[PDB]
């Protein structure tokens, strides 16, 4: 249920970001576009350097990234800044892959990201009232 909703949002964001195209999960995506695009624009150069270091070879070479996304939270801190920074890098990575192969898909990547968030941060996510909290946290 919470996995399903996260995967929807994350996948859709990543999917737009790569293809350039297109209740509460609906606002979570608006928020994601607004904020995520910000961090990608703001840190395009750092993401690029990191992306080159990922040696990510194909739509399924997501294990290096998953290792990375895990060590982020490896200090005991979770916040939406980190979470949203992870998804933005996911989008930034999703866009590169199409440069490399217009065919390749974002599913493995969306699932990679969701796995780490939902399955290792479940309790934290829950404590925050879920994507409702994320939406509230970034309200304008």
């Amino acid at each position: 249920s919470l996995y399903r909703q996260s995967l929807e949002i994350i996948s859709r964001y990543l999917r737009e970001q790569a293809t350039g195209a297109k209740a509460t999960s609906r606002k979570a995506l608006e928020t994601l576009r607004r904020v995520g695009d910000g961090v990608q624009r703001n840190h395009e150069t750092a993401f690029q350097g990191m992306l080159r270091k990922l040696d990510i070879k194909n739509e399924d070479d997501v294990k290096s990234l998953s290792r990375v996304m895990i060590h982020v939270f490896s200090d005991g801190v979770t916040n939406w800044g980190r979470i949203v920074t992870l998804i933005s890098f996911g989008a930034f990575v999703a866009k590169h892959l199409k440069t490399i192969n217009q065919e390749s898909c974002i599913e493995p990547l969306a699932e990679s990201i969701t796995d780490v968030l939902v399955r290792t941060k479940r309790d934290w996510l829950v404590k925050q009232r879920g994507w409702d909290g994320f939406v509230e946290f970034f309200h304008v």
Binding site: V35, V39, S64, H71, V72, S74, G81, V84
Partner: peptide, 27 residues
């Protein structure tokens, strides 16, 4: 290996972004 270098980078941006919202919220 270098995984610690990349996670440290994303960690910072996330915190940077978090610090910015935490502020915009306190006011």
């Amino acid at each position: 290996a270098s995984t610690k270098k990349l996670s440290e980078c994303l960690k910072r941006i996330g915190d940077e972004l978090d610090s910015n919202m935490e502020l915009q919220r306190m006011i």
